[PDB]
Amino acid sequence: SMVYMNIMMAFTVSLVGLLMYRSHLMSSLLCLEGMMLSLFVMAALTILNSHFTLASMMPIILLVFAACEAALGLSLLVMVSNTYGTDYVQNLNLL
Amino acid sequence: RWQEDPEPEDENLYEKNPDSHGYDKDPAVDIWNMRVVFFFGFSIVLVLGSTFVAYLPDYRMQEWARREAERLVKYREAHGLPIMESNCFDPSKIQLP
Amino acid sequence: XXXXXXXXXXXXXXXXXXXXXXXXXXPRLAFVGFLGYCSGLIDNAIRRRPVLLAGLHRQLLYITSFVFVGYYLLKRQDYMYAVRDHDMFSYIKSHXXXXXXXXXXXXXXXXXXX
Amino acid sequence: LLQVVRDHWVHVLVPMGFVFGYYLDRKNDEKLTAFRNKSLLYKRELKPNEEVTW
Amino acid sequence: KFYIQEPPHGSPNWLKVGLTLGTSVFLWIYLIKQHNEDVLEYKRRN
Amino acid sequence: XXXXXXXXXXXXXXXXXXXXXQAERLAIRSRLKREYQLQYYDPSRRGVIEDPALVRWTYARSANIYPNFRPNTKTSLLGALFGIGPLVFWYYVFKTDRDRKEKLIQEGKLDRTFNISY
Amino acid sequence: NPIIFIIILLTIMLGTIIVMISSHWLLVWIGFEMNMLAIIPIMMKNHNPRATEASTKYFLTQSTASMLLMMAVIINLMFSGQWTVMKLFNPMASMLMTMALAMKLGMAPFHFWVPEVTQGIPLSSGLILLTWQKLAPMSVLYQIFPSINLNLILTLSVLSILIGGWGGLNQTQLRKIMAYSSIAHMGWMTAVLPYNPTMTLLNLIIYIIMTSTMFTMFMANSTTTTLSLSHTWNKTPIMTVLILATLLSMGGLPPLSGFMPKWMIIQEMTKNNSIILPTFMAITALLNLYFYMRLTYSTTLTMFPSTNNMKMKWQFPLMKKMTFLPTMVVLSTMMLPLTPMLSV
Amino acid sequence: XXXXXXXXXXXXXXXXXXXXXXXXXXXXXXXXXXXXXXXXXXXXXXXXXXXXXXXXXXXXXXXXXXXXXXXXXXXXXXXXXXXXXXGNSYRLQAWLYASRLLQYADALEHLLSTGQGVVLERSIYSDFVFLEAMYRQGFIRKQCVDHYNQVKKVTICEYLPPHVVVYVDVPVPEVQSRIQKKGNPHEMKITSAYLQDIENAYKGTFLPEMSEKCEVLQYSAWEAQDAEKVVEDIEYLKYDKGPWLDQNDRNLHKLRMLVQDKLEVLNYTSIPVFLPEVTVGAHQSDQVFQEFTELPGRKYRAGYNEDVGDKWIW
Amino acid sequence: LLDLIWLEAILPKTISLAQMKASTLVTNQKGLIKLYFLSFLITILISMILFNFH
Amino acid sequence: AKTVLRQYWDIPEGTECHRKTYATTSIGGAAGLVVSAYSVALKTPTSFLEGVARTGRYTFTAAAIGAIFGLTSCISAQVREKPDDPLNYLIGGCAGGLILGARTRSYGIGAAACAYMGLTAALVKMGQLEGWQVFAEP
Amino acid sequence: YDKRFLKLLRFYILLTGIPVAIGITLINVXXXXXXXXXXXXXXXXXXXXXXXXXXXXXXXXX
Amino acid sequence: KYIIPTIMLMPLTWLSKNNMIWVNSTAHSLLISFTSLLLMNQFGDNSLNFSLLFFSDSLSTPLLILTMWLLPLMLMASQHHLSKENLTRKKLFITMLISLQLFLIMTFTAMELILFYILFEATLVPTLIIITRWGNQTERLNAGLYFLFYTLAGSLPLLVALIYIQNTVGSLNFLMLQYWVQPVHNSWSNVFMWLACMMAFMVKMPLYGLHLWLPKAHVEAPIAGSMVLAAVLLKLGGYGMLRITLILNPMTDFMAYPFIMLSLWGMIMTSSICLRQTDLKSLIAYSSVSHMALVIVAILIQTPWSYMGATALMIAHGLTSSMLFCLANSNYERIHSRTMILARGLQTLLPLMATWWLLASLTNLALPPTINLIGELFVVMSTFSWSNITIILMGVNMVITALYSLYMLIMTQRGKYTYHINNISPSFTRENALMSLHILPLLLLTLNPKIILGPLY
Amino acid sequence: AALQAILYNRIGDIGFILAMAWFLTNLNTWDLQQIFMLNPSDSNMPLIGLALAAT
């Protein structure tokens, strides 16, 4: 309507952020929590304006799962450095 | 290098260790197969089968149509003017256009 | 129909429409029974065992399981085709205007030469 | 008796398969019993035998 | 050969063979009784 | 192909270059015959001899197709005009016969009354 | 590894149940994330330099995809309001919805991760997981088949068989061939969704059974074409006949069960009057046949793969459904024409 | 189905006097073979030395397979007078490497299920000593060794523990005179440089084995033949920082499954690579597979067999 | 000309050109998560701008 | 865009063709830009100097296919009688695929697939009649 | 090898040449054909339509 | 009546003992082939349906009898081959013939188009396994891949064609039901509908364009020479053109006009190449193009006279070209090469087989009325009523049909073979028995060709 | 020598089979007993036919 357009514009920048890769792999895991942050604000405004009360529980569940993927991806980042030296998008073997 | 790949043997029955045969190995199996059941189908399908083919069971109304045509010729010549076909299988059709 | 309208969602058997009578020793059942016997031939090829046909007597499990699942599978087949026909015939009678009949006509058509 | 049955087992199955094939394919006419006697092509009234011919 | 160095399968398990042949009997009776019930249900309705 | 005078014995000189030329041809001819001679006169063989000349002769027509035809230039394109071209040539031959035949059936009959087959 | 591995495998089964039995849009989002936490541990297992590359590649090219799905869920609050898995209502919502599912099923512009992920798995049992995971987002598309723009789903059907039919041609790795065979078969899946939603579930049943048999035939260690070449001339000779039967069915051929997909997909598409699209589907399907054709030459030809080592001891594998499923994968044609009704 | 979920568990009923001992790198003469029989006073299980017919010695058949039934052209007498081009040379060693790996797989399976001490004659880790000694002289080409190193990197890394106790016997360079005194005429008249190269390579084989914190005790020719001295050394030597000490639940479970089945371990040993000394020919392979199927031993294979056993058909 | 070259020439148009188009989808992109995600930027822009649907 | 494609079908109803030539370049140019975007995945050496060099070779050639196709559609229409025909666009399809052999010095390949490109261009122009549909709904 | 083939061929032609010889006598002993207008009672009995040879009716029954 | 006893041949070869096998497969096949000439021959004015549409009756197809004739004949010459290898390899490739015969019986009998399609393509799978394996020379794959990517490339357009007809006009099914079929209005949308129905039977029935499928399969021998006859059975196996053109598109013949001319040039140019060719199997491979091209011309004319010769040619070619391949096989297992020039010598070395070489070569020519004259003559007579210019081109073809077979004779009727020492035994009983079982049915069809040439005859 | 005797005869066959095909298309009887009655005046039959068979 008005406030939604700004946070949708913040989503599009973070969308590019997940599709852009430069040197380190750490940027993606910031953008994974970044994109979930933008979705959380969008969920909070939609539910509260046209009141739900029952469905206001749903973004709290979403916020739990927001870091569920982020914790697993950040733990995968650990094992790549052990096999190599430093985590790099530039450094990959598979074809 | 081939190692084991170089392995080829020329084999021919001809007459050596076969006497006179068609099937490879065993003289007892050869006579009972290549001369008996090989020639049993040669005797049933070709000689006893020749009686059928087209001769005997009429075959798609070939002989029936001859006797059927002859009786229709003599009847139509005695009564009608037109012989067999003139305006057949169409009488008082519902217009044209 | 893809979506249910008359029947209740999530059911193994029909139950609501049971009256149809299932097939008794059908020609279709014999082929599924043959497929149960065929599975009892190829398992002795994977696990190297003497004789495909005259092997172990664990084949009876393979014959029974294919018949048992197949009987319920064929029961679902005859039910779903019947509902398809039931909905189709009811649609024509309810509308009436959608269907039109035309019979007995003599019309000219172009004949091909040679 | 014991030597004859042990020798031939697969040989008996092929003519036995022909009898089973002939019987099963004949039974299909019982499903197609409709229009047994209709119009004038091959229709006659019964005298002694039931339903003319199968 | 007489099965040298102990075979993985002795050949008659009895515990496993008995259940596989046992379950086949259980399945056969269960289907025919439902088949007999289906014929009674079809005659009652139509 | 033949010229004005048929070649059989015409234009031949002894010289020195031709004398060594016959020595070259007879050397290979005897070389390929001796390997046949050792394989022909023995009872232990029984079997048809291969020979590298005849195998390559059959391989010349059945194979060696796609390694060839890489410089097409114009000679290959002229073969296509003699290839699919005759199909276009006969396309106007039969079509003129159809315009002749179809017109005669409708107006001014040409088909005989005795005709009935096909 | 001993106890918890069964639990981890069970959570993928339980995760799909949340997707299958659902009415809420956030509930399926949970179900997709239940798979994310449960596949990646089995992706690693042995811990390899090749496995570390694939596990992160599988994570980043799927978790970001599910995040696009949540946008479409939030647009269902922005527009139309109600949290119900029936219709998307907005055309703007459906575009971000379909492209999110295209990362898992559509494949046509999102195939890139598949060949690297499939080769990266060290276990033969882990190869089943990728072919079984595709069951989850199909149940979503089975619910939201209306409202979605057909112009941008049928492009994910036509182009996917093109890249699937070309992408396997220049690959010798056995896992990579099966990776693009997945893309080839997923192309058919996205084509039935606009034209009659029934049979699309049966398309999976034919596909899953055929693929689950394939990897269980490779329980005897094989990773390349030349390694699977030494199977009849060194190991079990009768095993290659069943590999031949499965490969001849994977490509659409009438005397096998793998023509039953090609039967009804074209049949239902022609009922909606479309000629030019299903013609292109049939010609591109020939390109799919070529991979299996070259892989049947490991079972038919001599090829000389004898090697110095010769096996004498009897093989004892797991083999979960390596006897019941190939029989349904080989000779299901006569007991098949009435089966479309039985699925749904 | 996995049985480790039930009452059966890894590392249970072992540990105390359960570690495996091996006699590796004995130059050429069988000096380690005689002392391995006396080493069975402390350890319960003892296995025979690997040869051309060692995989065929167990497996399923009671009697050993003869020539054509087993590996094609594989004999120690034929390799004694080794000839280049269309010969043994490498194809003996590739079959020998797989046979040592197969008996080790049975030995590790015997160690895990019911804890008993297993003594093995010449380990898989001592195979490259026998290869490189023949490589120094003009016998094996460089391209064949590159094929061997690919098998070396795959087969070894799958198994977690090498050996707890390793016995190395280093004799004098006059070991060729001791080998000539033996009753075997085919083993005699071997190359003097080939036996010396095996002793030189053993010094660069025991040193990397000791560097990995695995216990190794050297025994001299004068200290040889002693049974009480060798048995006391096994109980005295304590494992410190060794690779044998691993996780009981996670590490031991994977190694037990890989060693249980013979087909699972031998599959990695067969490499998909063309080699001159590998026998690639499919035409000879088809006749060899026909003869193995016609053999009275295996024939139908796995438990049930016609005209050899036949206990149950139902 | 015809029987072995020009009538066979229809086949490389569907085989050799197909293999040429195949090589541009297999050997392309030397690994890298970067490269595959660079193409995903365009895919959304095709559906939004280049395609009229929403 | 489909709105650009809708403008194309309104032109052949009359005799005017000067607007038709510009309409084909907009479709042909945009189709080249898609192929130019996927060629970035190949990774260009250095920056901009070779990066824009690969965009130039693809977009200019793809627009040239459309430009000749737009011209040849009306050369066959103005000269001689008869309106829209499958044979009329077949001549137009031949000239479009001819310049692919002019792009790379080989004289064939594109010119070898002159009949292949021409038939496919005619098949789209078969869709002007009601007996052809690309994507169906009912 | 050549002359034996012709003798082995002829042995099996003559073996089934016996019912050929009986086939001629079947025309001789049994009635061949008769053409007459049939009374309305039965259209088919054993054979529906029998003409020329009596062997046609024998094959029509089976 | 026919299916079930044919399926019972599958457990026969597997259950029988190791020494036998070949005796049971040949003897039991001969008694089943007797019953085909016993029951199928009965027909009225219009041939009445057999039973339910699983397998139906024959209206104009006595070509089933030919498949039943080759049912034991293919097992005869495959005795010399396969004998060296294992018993399981023997049992597999006998059952692959039985599976071929199972699907081949299903193709001709079943009066359908929808279920007929999934039996037409279903015959390709067993032949693929047979052709790719047991190849004496190399390039097996340059014939195996060619076997599918020509047929399936043309036949998969039937799925979009046949289903399109039944979705608009009732259902295809019985064909006896098909009076619902209305004449085509001749539209550009209906152009590719006709082409899709034709192209499937334009590959298996070899033209001049897309003909390369055939000679590659014949030169690269499947097993010995008797499995080559199964590929001959697939030429005549594409008989659906007799059913589609007659029923589905009777008004359409304007689009047939260029396709007659494409097959007309597949007569002069196909005979020209078959003169300088080196391979003996290739000389039969290109002669098989011309004989089947005569059928293609006949079908597209659609005159009642052409079908009488077309149906006759299907039976004529199936027993004469297969006879010629057996003669090629009889030299292939003695000389071990397909070379014509190397294997040269009849009567001096092969006394009684030379007379079989004559009768097989004379059948390519127009002999006193056997079946080949009867089959060809109706086509020549039908073409003149179609267009008068035809026999000027068709007469030239009659000159090179002599050169098709006399060149085979001349390069075998020469007292040489100086390089050759093998081929001591000329014919081991069954070798000449194969040749008699191919020619004597043609000699019996001299007396009764009414059984062979019968589309409403 | 034996090949040419058929080769030149088969070029003579071009006319002969053309004379066969013309005979059926013009006259339904096909046999030689017809042409004695209702004989049509045509140059196409004996010239391109019997005269060509006479070579």
Side-chain angles (χ1 to χ4, degrees), chain L residues 358-374:
Chain L
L358 284 153
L359 286 153
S361 54
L362 297 178
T363 39
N364 281 45
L365 281 133
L367 270 169
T370 46
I371 190 156
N372 292 263
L373 168 66
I374 308 154

Side-chain angles (χ1 to χ4, degrees), chain H residues 3 6 27 41 43 57 76 92 96 100 104 110 113 115 165 167 193 201:
Chain H
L92 182 90
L96 202 138
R100 290 211 204 274
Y104 184 85
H110 194 264
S113 59
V165 189
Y167 291 96

Side-chain angles (χ1 to χ4, degrees), chain C residues 47-50 54-55 57-58, chain H residues 302:
Chain C
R47 290 174 183 89
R48 208 195 278 264
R49 292 284 283 266
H57 275 276
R58 58 185 175 183

Side-chain angles (χ1 to χ4, degrees), chain J residues 17-31:
Chain J
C17 282
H18 301 274
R19 197 79 75 178
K20 202 181 179 181
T21 49
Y22 191 81
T24 49
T25 49
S26 61
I27 308 155

Side-chain angles (χ1 to χ4, degrees), chain B residues 27-60:
Chain B
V29 189
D30 181 71
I31 308 298
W32 199 68
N33 176 50
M34 294 281 168
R35 281 150 195 87
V36 186
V37 291
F38 261 65
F39 284 90
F40 252 94
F42 198 89
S43 62
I44 299 156
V45 192
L46 282 154
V47 189
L48 288 156
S50 69
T51 53
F52 293 93
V53 188
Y55 174 72
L56 294 170
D58 189 55
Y59 200 83
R60 61 177 71 201

Side-chain angles (χ1 to χ4, degrees), chain C residues 35-48:
Chain C
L35 281 156
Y37 192 81
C38 194
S39 60
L41 292 155
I42 54 100
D43 75 316
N44 295 296
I46 301 146
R47 290 174 183 89
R48 208 195 278 264

